[PDB]
Amino acid sequence: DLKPNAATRDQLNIIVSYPPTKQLTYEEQDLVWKFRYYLTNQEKALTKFLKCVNWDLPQEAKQALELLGKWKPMDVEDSLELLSSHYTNPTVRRYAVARLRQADDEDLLMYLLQLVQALKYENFDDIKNGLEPINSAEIDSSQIITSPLPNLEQDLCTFLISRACKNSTLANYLYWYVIVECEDQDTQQRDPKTHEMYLNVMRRFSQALLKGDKSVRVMRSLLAAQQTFVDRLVHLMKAVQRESGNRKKKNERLQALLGDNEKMNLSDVELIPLPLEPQVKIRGIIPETATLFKSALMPAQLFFKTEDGGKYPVIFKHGDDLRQDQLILQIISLMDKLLRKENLDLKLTPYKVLATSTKHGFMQFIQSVPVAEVLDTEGSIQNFFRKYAPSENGPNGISAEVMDTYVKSCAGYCVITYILGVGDRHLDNLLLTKTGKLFHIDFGYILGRDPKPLPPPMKLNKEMVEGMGGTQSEQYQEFRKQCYTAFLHLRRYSNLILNLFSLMVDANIPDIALEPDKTVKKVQDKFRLDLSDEEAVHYMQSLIDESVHALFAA
Ligand SMILES: O=c1cc(N2CCOCC2)nc2n1CC[C@@H](C(F)(F)F)N2C[C@H](O)c1ccccc1
Numbered sequence: 001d002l003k004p005n006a007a008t009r010d011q012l013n014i015i016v017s018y019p020p021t022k023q024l025t026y027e028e029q030d031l032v033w034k035f036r037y038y039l040t041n042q043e044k045a046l047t048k049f050l051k052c053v054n055w056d057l058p059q060e061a062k063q064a065l066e067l068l069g070k071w072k073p074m075d076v077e078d079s080l081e082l083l084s085s086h087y088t089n090p091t092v093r094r095y096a097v098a099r100l101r102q103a104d105d106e107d108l109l110m111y112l113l114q115l116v117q118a119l120k121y122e123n124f125d126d127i128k129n130g131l132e133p134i135n136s137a138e139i140d141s142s143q144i145i146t147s148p149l150p151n152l153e154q155d156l157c158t159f160l161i162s163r164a165c166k167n168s169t170l171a172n173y174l175y176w177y178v179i180v181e182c183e184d185q186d187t188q189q190r191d192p193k194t195h196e197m198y199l200n201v202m203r204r205f206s207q208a209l210l211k212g213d214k215s216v217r218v219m220r221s222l223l224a225a226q227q228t229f230v231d232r233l234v235h236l237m238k239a240v241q242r243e244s245g246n247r248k249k250k251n252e253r254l255q256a257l258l259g260d261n262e263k264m265n266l267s268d269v270e271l272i273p274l275p276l277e278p279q280v281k282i283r284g285i286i287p288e289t290a291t292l293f294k295s296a297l298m299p300a301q302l303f304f305k306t307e308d309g310g311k312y313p314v315i316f317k318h319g320d321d322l323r324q325d326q327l328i329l330q331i332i333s334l335m336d337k338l339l340r341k342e343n344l345d346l347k348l349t350p351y352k353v354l355a356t357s358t359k360h361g362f363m364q365f366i367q368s369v370p371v372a373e374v375l376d377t378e379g380s381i382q383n384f385f386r387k388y389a390p391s392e393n394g395p396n397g398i399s400a401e402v403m404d405t406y407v408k409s410c411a412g413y414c415v416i417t418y419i420l421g422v423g424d425r426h427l428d429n430l431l432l433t434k435t436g437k438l439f440h441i442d443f444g445y446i447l448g449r450d451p452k453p454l455p456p457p458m459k460l461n462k463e464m465v466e467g468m469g470g471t472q473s474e475q476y477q478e479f480r481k482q483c484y485t486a487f488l489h490l491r492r493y494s495n496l497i498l499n500l501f502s503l504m505v506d507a508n509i510p511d512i513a514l515e516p517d518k519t520v521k522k523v524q525d526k527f528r529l530d531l532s533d534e535e536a537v538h539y540m541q542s543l544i545d546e547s548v549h550a551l552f553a554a
């Protein structure tokens with residue numbers, strides 16, 4: 001093989017270190033191609049090499065595939081890039097699936113939402129041909145599972161179904177994520193072949209479950225029971241939303257219908273996995289504690305009876321698209337897991353969000369109080385903390401543990417909302433727990449979007465700073481430390497985070513759909529990959545200093 005000199009090797013290392021959005025010039029491509037055999041020893045060089053290939057040229061594609069098979073095994077992040085819209089070559093996509101096969105189900109679950117999006121770039125004929133022995137509108141996606149009839153060998157569809165058949169948690173999310181994709185009216189009208197593909201994925205999944213062993217066949221019946229339960233809940237929600245009168249009158253209708261099990265079948269059901277969190281098995285909804293929230297959207301707070309005698313409160317929305325919130329909460333869940341991997345638990349609240357359609361879905365209810373209500377009832381965050389968690393020896397008369405949780409969650413969310421460009425940040429969408437956990441909700445505005453003009457990049461307020469004990473407190477120093485530490489940890493996983501956002505470009509998420517080609521760059525810019533770790537610390541410190549000076553000047 002051709003060996004490049006020291007100067008060329010250094011030049012190739014700079015190209016290999018380029019950020020994800022960085023496009024290689026034709027001259028850089030010629031250089032990478034010239035030393036393709038040398039670069040085979042570097043797993044990070046593979047994604048740069050594949051950017052040099054014109055997939056419309058059969059021999060160039062063939063040359064690339066031979067090197068792909070000789071290359072040092074790629075990482076999971078790089079396999080996620082090979083499943084994006086950029087790579088439609090079936091063999092390239094098979095190699096990416098071969099890498100995901102080596103990953104644990106725990107990691108696979110973290111990327112499942114994006115892997116379901118990646119099906120849009122798969123071979124639609126291969127997915128259809130996998131079906132064993134009409135107009136798409138005649139196939140109600142919700143009726144597939146409820147109507148059972150009396151190393152490079154696997155594509156993405158075959159792989160996802162195979163793993164789902166062995167894991168009930170994976171099967172739950174695969175079922176619901178595919179149902180939402182089938183229910184996408186924008187996909188149904190603009191790309192009927194994609195809508196047909198998603199129906200075929202569901203039909204393939206139902207077929208594989210029915211061919212499985214005793215536990216696998218039971219999984220199909222449990223998915224059918226969940227679909228039927230959700231269908232019944234949607235019918236109930238429609239009746240409550242149509243009920244003439246005030247919220248009290250709607251609550252009476254809500255409780256009466258939930259209480260009528262012979263008609264609705266919602267309060268007394270056989271043990272079924274909760275769609276929102278399938279590890280939690282439910283007995284039904286408690287009729288007498290179900291109420292609507294004060295909102296024109298009419299969302300309901302529902303308490304589920306768990307198998308172990310517990311109560312699982314949820315928010316169920318009908319007539320709203322939960323997909324943007326679903327993506328943000330799954331990214332927050334991933335960010336929390338990555339921070340925990342680096343041994344940093346910032347006491348975040350990645351509450352569960354699951355769309356059951358593009359029109360309805362669940363949200364895990366965390367017992368908490370919005371900051372606006374905290375000020376109206378107690379006056380301040382510190383007063384709320386002194387009332388529910390007092391300590392004579394603790395900082396400002398508050399439990400040390402509660403204060404530590406507050407500082408950590410403030411810092412965690414400060415860094416996360418900045419990276420995700422979360423807008424519309426007011427005191428009603430900032431929530432607080434009696435354990436000290438501060439968290440964000442309602443992700444209607446992301447990636448720099450805001451209802452007000454000129455939004456600040458850092459989402460800090462006077463109430464947050466006062467809750468810590470001011471700018472001169474030991475808590476404020478801890479907050480700054482946790483901010484730059486969380487920032488450095490997340491920057492290390494920028495390749496992963498960006499590759500997952502790249503898989504969401506065609507997902508019909510409002511704030512992504514607005515500018516799909518600029519989405520990845522918006523997130524990439526927040527990581528400041530142009531700066532070294534030391535420079536990133538000072539940049540994060542500058543963001544905090546500016547935000548604090550600006551908020552106090554009010
Ligand atoms: O997106 C979300 C997420 C969410 N979480 C609740 C805490 O656990 C995590 C999820 N709550 C809401 N929203 C949309 C706006 C309203 C809704 F849905 F009622 F309209 N609320 C309820 C309101 O904030 C509320 C009311 C009373 C107490 C606490 C909270």
Ligand code: NA
Binds near residue numbers: 137138139
């Ligand atoms: Na039908």
Ligand code: NA
Binds near residue numbers: 346
């Ligand atoms: Na947490």
